[PDB]
Amino acid sequence: ERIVLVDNKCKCARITSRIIRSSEDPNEDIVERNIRIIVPLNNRENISDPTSPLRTRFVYHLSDLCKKCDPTEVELDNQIVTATQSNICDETCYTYDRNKCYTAVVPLVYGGETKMVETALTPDACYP
Amino acid sequence: IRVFAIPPSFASIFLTKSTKLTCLVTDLTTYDSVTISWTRQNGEAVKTHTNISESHPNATFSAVGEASICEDDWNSGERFTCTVTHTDLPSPLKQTISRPKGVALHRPDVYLLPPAREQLNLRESATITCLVTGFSPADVFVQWMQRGQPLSPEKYVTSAPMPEPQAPGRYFAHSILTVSEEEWNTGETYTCVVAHEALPNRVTERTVDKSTGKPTLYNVSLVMSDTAGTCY
Amino acid sequence: IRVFAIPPSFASIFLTKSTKLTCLVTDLTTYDSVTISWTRQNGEAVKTHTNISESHPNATFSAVGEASICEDDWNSGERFTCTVTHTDLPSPLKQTISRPKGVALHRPDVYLLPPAREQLNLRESATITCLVTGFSPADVFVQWMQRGQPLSPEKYVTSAPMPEPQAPGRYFAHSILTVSEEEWNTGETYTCVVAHEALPNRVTERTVDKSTGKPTLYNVSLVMSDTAGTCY
Amino acid sequence: PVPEGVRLADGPGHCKGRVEVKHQNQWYTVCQTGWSLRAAKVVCRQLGCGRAVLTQKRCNKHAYGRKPIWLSQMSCSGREATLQDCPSGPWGKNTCNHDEDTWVECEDPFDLRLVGGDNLCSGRLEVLHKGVWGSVCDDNWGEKEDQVVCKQLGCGKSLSPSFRDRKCYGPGVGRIWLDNVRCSGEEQSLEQCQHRFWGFHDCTHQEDVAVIC
Numbered sequence: 001e002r003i004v005l006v007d008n009k010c011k012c013a014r015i016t017s018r019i020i021r022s023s024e025d026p027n028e029d030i031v032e033r034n035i036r037i038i039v040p041l042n043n044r045e046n047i048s049d050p051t052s053p054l055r056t057r058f059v060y061h062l063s064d065l066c067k068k069c070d071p072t073e074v075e076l077d078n079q080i081v082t083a084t085q086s087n088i089c090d091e092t093c094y095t096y097d098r099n100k101c102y103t104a105v106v107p108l109v110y111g112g113e114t115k116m117v118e119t120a121l122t123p124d125a126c127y128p
Numbered sequence: 129i130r131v132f133a134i135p136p137s138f139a140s141i142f143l144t145k146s147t148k149l150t151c152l153v154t155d156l157t158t159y160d161s162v163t164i165s166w167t168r169q170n171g172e173a174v175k176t177h178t179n180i181s182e183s184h185p186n187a188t189f190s191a192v193g194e195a196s197i198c199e200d201d202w203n204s205g206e207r208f209t210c211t212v213t214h215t216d217l218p219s220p221l222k223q224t225i226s227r228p229k230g231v232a233l234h235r236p237d238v239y240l241l242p243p244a245r246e247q248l249n250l251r252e253s254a255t256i257t258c259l260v261t262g263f264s265p266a267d268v269f270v271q272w273m274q275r276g277q278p279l280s281p282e283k284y285v286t287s288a289p290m291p292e293p294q295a296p297g298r299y300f301a302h303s304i305l306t307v308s309e310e311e312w313n314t315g316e317t318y319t320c321v322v323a324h325e326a327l328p329n330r331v332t333e334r335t336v337d338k339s340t341g342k343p344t345l346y347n348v349s350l351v352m353s354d355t356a357g358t359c360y
Numbered sequence: 361i362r363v364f365a366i367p368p369s370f371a372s373i374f375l376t377k378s379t380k381l382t383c384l385v386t387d388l389t390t391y392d393s394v395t396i397s398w399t400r401q402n403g404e405a406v407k408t409h410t411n412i413s414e415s416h417p418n419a420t421f422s423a424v425g426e427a428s429i430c431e432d433d434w435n436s437g438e439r440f441t442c443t444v445t446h447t448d449l450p451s452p453l454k455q456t457i458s459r460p461k462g463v464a465l466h467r468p469d470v471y472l473l474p475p476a477r478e479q480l481n482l483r484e485s486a487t488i489t490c491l492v493t494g495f496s497p498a499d500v501f502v503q504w505m506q507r508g509q510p511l512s513p514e515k516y517v518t519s520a521p522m523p524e525p526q527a528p529g530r531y532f533a534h535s536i537l538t539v540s541e542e543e544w545n546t547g548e549t550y551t552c553v554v555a556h557e558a559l560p561n562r563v564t565e566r567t568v569d570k571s572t573g574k575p576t577l578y579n580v581s582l583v584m585s586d587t588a589g590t591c592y
Numbered sequence: 593p594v595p596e597g598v599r600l601a602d603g604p605g606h607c608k609g610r611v612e613v614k615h616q617n618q619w620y621t622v623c624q625t626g627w628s629l630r631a632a633k634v635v636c637r638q639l640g641c642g643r644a645v646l647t648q649k650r651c652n653k654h655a656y657g658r659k660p661i662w663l664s665q666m667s668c669s670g671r672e673a674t675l676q677d678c679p680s681g682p683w684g685k686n687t688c689n690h691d692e693d694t695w696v697e698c699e700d701p702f703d704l705r706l707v708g709g710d711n712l713c714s715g716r717l718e719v720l721h722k723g724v725w726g727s728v729c730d731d732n733w734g735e736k737e738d739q740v741v742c743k744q745l746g747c748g749k750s751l752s753p754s755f756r757d758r759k760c761y762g763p764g765v766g767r768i769w770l771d772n773v774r775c776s777g778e779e780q781s782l783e784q785c786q787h788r789f790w791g792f793h794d795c796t797h798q799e800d801v802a803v804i805c
């Protein structure tokens with residue numbers, strides 16, 4: 001019955017909130033705030049850079065995670081108008097995305113050919 | 129005995145998409161048909177729908193004369209005047225009307241306040257407040273919507289835009305939507321649509337329900353896994 | 361007395377874009393200019409710029425073949441032969457070389473093993489091993505780069521692909537990189553770029569440094585700035 | 593005395609323009625006091641355009657385009673398919689208070705194409721929102737939207753590709769229109785399926801999606 005507030009997939013943070021009915025009285029029901037954050041201990045600071053240093057500090061601004069500037073459509077009396085959902089936005093992130101695929105260009109040398117081939121940083125998402 | 133000279137606001141030129149201009153002559157003196165003729169700078173009579181008002185409680189004759197000139201005349205900044213021609217009590221009134229010229233533009237920082245926990249304990253009449261503040265031309269239109277469908281206009285009262293106390297140039301305007309407490313306690317989503325000139329897409333929608341409100345117990349879990357490079 | 365029959369590996373086709381062919385003749389006989397003629401199925405002579413540039417202690421001359429056979433002709437899987445014309449010891453050395461037809465393609469599942477702490481405690485050198493394992497075409501090309509520029513090919517040692525013990529159709533190779541102790545302890549990221557036929561992208565790269573490879577110390581710092589408030 | 597087909601003329605195409613009406617082979621322009629997006633939805637649903645967007649009651653010079661004013665006033669419920677279904681009861685009362693006309697602007701109808709294939713119903717997926725032919729994203733691309741796209745063109749069912757023919761059938765050039773297209777299998781067109789906003793994606797062109805039917 002819990003709804004998903006954000007389901008951010010490159011900063012692993014699944015914010016859900018449920019109004020769990022703790023009693024028959026509908027006033028003392030507590031509004032839960034489940035924030036499930038999966039912290040990659042082996043991912044680097046720039047995830048598209050293999051040679052980047054390992055990430056030691058993970059900072060999760062939940063005001064930035066809960067941001068919404070996909071403009072929704074509301075229906076007025078004589079018009080359909082795009083509606084901005086937040087005043088915050090008008091970005092670095094720590095985990096790979098399962099839907100996306102990230103690539104890196106590495107120099108491969110056989111003598112002096114120096115062919116700049118590409119490398120699939122994750123293998124499963126590019127070629128399932 | 130009173131008169132009005134209402135200009136088209138940003139409400140009446142956005143939800144209806146037609147700049148309606150009327151000078152509400154309100155029960156001055158018993159006349160057969162109070163003619164109302166809007167005029168431009170040269171002074172020709174704009175084609176005005178002159179409607180005779182219904183029987184007032186004070187029963188003196190009133191009229192509503194509206195002429196829907198389009199957006200170019202109001203956007204150009206040209207003053208108007210309805211030449212209300214008086215044969216009975218012959219005192220002509222030049223009720224002038226013009227757009228605000230050269231006013232500033234500041235974005236409305238709209239916030240949505242859920243009903244107070246003190247108020248919900250009385251089990252009726254939850255009041256949700258759409259605090260629209262920080263708008264400079266002082267013309268704001270606020271509509272409350274349920275699930276994308278607009279609410280009744282009697283369900284909410286939007287205050288007139290009063291000046292901001294701290295900031296001199298900006299203004300603010302409340303919107304008290306009174307709903308049943310059993311409606312708000314089911315987590316029903318309430319959306320405040322606010323329209324103003326300074327907004328980029330010209331309409332802002334903020335949503336509130338019991339899930340969006342301040343959580344009384346967080347459930348933070350920080351899974352520290354060294355193998356999940358991707359996300360679950 | 362020994363003539364190589366070295367085939368074009370997938371490195372020499374994937375990087376140089378031309379299937380380089382050779383049959384290096386070492387200390388065979390005293391014949392003035394050892395004539396290497398690359399012969400196809402039809403037997404016509406392709407352009408063979410034979411190179412004589414190696415000095416032998418036995419005063420026996422050397423010859424290296426050269427063929428510009430295209431990739432589509434080699435991938436059809438035909439039996440090739442340099443028909444070496446001999447006037448001294450006139451035995452036609454029809455050396456046979458062909459593609460293994462119908463072999464399976466299993467991608468290398470590559471792991472980068474950081475050097476063991478026992479070799480770290482010597483304070484002399486560190487040995488980084490790349491475990492390119494489980495590849496079926498059995499022609500591996502692993503190249504090392506130190507945080508962006510490629511390393512020297514003589515700095516690392518690449519083992520020949522031996523048959524994998526626990527799986528019949530797989531082959532495994534080692535890439536041993538012997539770097540200094542103070543180079544490893546500064547935290548330079550060492551990459552294992554391996555090129556192979558069997559991957560869809562044909563090139564993958566794994567990365568280790570001091571922090572990533574071995575969990576000697578995990579300085580994690582988690583900051584949750586807001587942890588409150590409204591969210592929708 | 594009833595709508596006999598409408599049109600949106602004197603404007604940018606057949607989807608946007610001044611709304612009119614037909615009765616016993618006289619073309620009558622429409623002017624109403626009670627007119628909202630409901631009557632716009634009925635007008636754009638009848639004529640053939642995609643979806644109603646905006647409706648004004650705009651000014652003009654009264655000498656130009658003086659078709660005679662449709663005196664019967666309707667109040668459309670919103671989900672009516674045709675103006676026959678709209679209640680046009682009162683015939684005779686003049687309701688056009690001011691000498692204006694109604695300007696309905698509909699969305700252009702949905703044209704979904706498979707571009708890049710070898711002249712079958714295959715290739716990368718391309719959609720038409722307003723005037724731009726653009727691709728969609730594959731964030732979460734499943735079989736339900738696959739068979740929805742295959743049934744939109746009327747070209748059978750999906751063959752369930754294994755990303756080889758999906759990758760080899762074009763990288764796709766153009767603005768990405770749709771992201772996170774989550775279908776159900778029963779929608780007759782991709783516009784009925786939920787997605788992100790039109791053109792508000794998070795993926796590049798290399799993350800394009802092809803559909804093989």
Ligand SMILES: *[C@@H]1O[C@H](CO)[C@@H](O[C@@H]2O[C@H](CO)[C@@H](O)[C@H](O)[C@H]2NC(C)=O)[C@H](O)[C@H]1NC(C)=O
Pocket residue numbers: 046047048049092103104105
């Ligand atoms: C993370 O690494 C990637 C790859 O090195 C960076 O992307 C490069 O950005 C520069 C500057 O815009 C471009 O010239 C390159 O072509 C990009 N390379 C690739 C493969 O996209 C990226 O900028 C890095 N991010 C940060 C924050 O440092």
Ligand SMILES: *[C@@H]1O[C@H](CO)[C@@H](O)[C@H](O)[C@H]1NC(C)=O
Pocket residue numbers: 056057579580581
């Ligand atoms: C540990 O991480 C914190 C977080 O940024 C950093 O300030 C500190 O310098 C780090 N210490 C070491 C020894 O890496």
Ligand SMILES: *[C@@H]1O[C@H](CO)[C@@H](O)[C@H](O)[C@H]1NC(C)=O
Pocket residue numbers: 034035036347348349
């Ligand atoms: C939320 O709290 C419940 C206990 O009330 C717990 O079982 C559950 O695991 C929590 N959610 C998460 C994501 O940890």
Ligand SMILES: [Ca+2]
Pocket residue numbers: 099100729730731732795799
């Ligand atoms: Ca994708």
Ligand SMILES: [Ca+2]
Pocket residue numbers: 731771772794
């Ligand atoms: Ca997406």
